[PDB]
Design an enzyme around this catalytic site. Sequence first.
Site, mmCIF file in Angstrom:
data_model
loop_
_atom_site.group_PDB
_atom_site.id
_atom_site.type_symbol
_atom_site.label_atom_id
_atom_site.label_comp_id
_atom_site.label_asym_id
_atom_site.label_seq_id
_atom_site.Cartn_x
_atom_site.Cartn_y
_atom_site.Cartn_z
ATOM 1 N N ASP A 226 0.827 -1.201 0.000
ATOM 2 C CA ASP A 226 0.000 0.000 0.000
ATOM 3 C C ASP A 226 0.861 1.251 0.000
ATOM 4 O O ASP A 226 1.353 1.659 1.050
ATOM 5 C CB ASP A 226 -0.902 0.005 1.241
ATOM 6 N N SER B 278 -0.831 15.653 -11.837
ATOM 7 C CA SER B 278 -1.086 15.325 -13.230
ATOM 8 C C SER B 278 -1.341 16.588 -14.056
ATOM 9 O O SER B 278 -1.913 17.556 -13.574
ATOM 10 C CB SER B 278 -2.293 14.383 -13.323
#
Length: 330
Positions: free
Chosen positions: A35, A199
Amino acid sequence: STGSATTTPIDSLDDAYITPVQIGTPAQTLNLDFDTGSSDLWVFSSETTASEVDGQTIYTPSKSTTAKLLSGATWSISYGDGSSSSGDVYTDTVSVGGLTVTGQAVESAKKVSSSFTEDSTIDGLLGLAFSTLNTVSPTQQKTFFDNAKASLDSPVFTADLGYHAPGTYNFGFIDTTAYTGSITYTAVSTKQGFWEWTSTGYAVGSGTFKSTSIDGIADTGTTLLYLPATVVSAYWAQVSGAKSSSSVGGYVFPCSATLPSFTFGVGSARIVIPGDYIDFGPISTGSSSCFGGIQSSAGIGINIFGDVALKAAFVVFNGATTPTLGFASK
């Protein structure tokens, strides 16, 4: 040193991925959920409330000659999905794909929430976010990656998750045969303890690319792709019959649909998520309403590039002094 381990979807929907991990001496192999969005290595154990164990493999520290109780240490974690676990702490030898850390904090669960009990395939979590998020008290502990880093050939790990197929976590090296073209690297903020990046925008299907900054985390422990409501609305608007259902808890779509791809920007580069990666199947057994793999982050407080996005790429988690993230197509 290096390590290399295969990671395998737990089910036919790629809800999560498990990677075998050797703990203790002699080795006890547990299948852990790696994770990158948390920083505790915790396991089902001989100490876990018996009624909360249902099929998981447990770690029994009393059977490990290298286990040592970390005196006074406890841990307690709550995840974004509402699940939780807590317990006490041992140090022991932990190996992943041939890479060994001695003195790793292994957090032994005394209690786990129902979602963990109900998932027989996940024996614990191995956190790979920054150690500043580790919950051990009163002395915070380091992640497996943090402990291994100095010994690694290069201070990196990579995630190569498969779509309905096995993939790979590598530590200490970049497998140049595992991706196509070039790896595009992008800046990371560690301020919130995550592999947080921005992004450069998105496209829906064959549509034009929208340049827009989307700050979010690269999170292998989250199944879906959670993005701003505007972005998500633009995606599902291209699917006839799709709608946001408050009763189901997100966007659903007719299972007869063909889903468009979703592209996200990494600098000037582009990662394309095929439409099929966005299908999470019937909302309930036999239903013709299917659950979408792109969902709104509104009310999470953060955008999450989960497995839906990451499995479309080869992803470098670069733990150099100034960390960065790299993405390549594959």
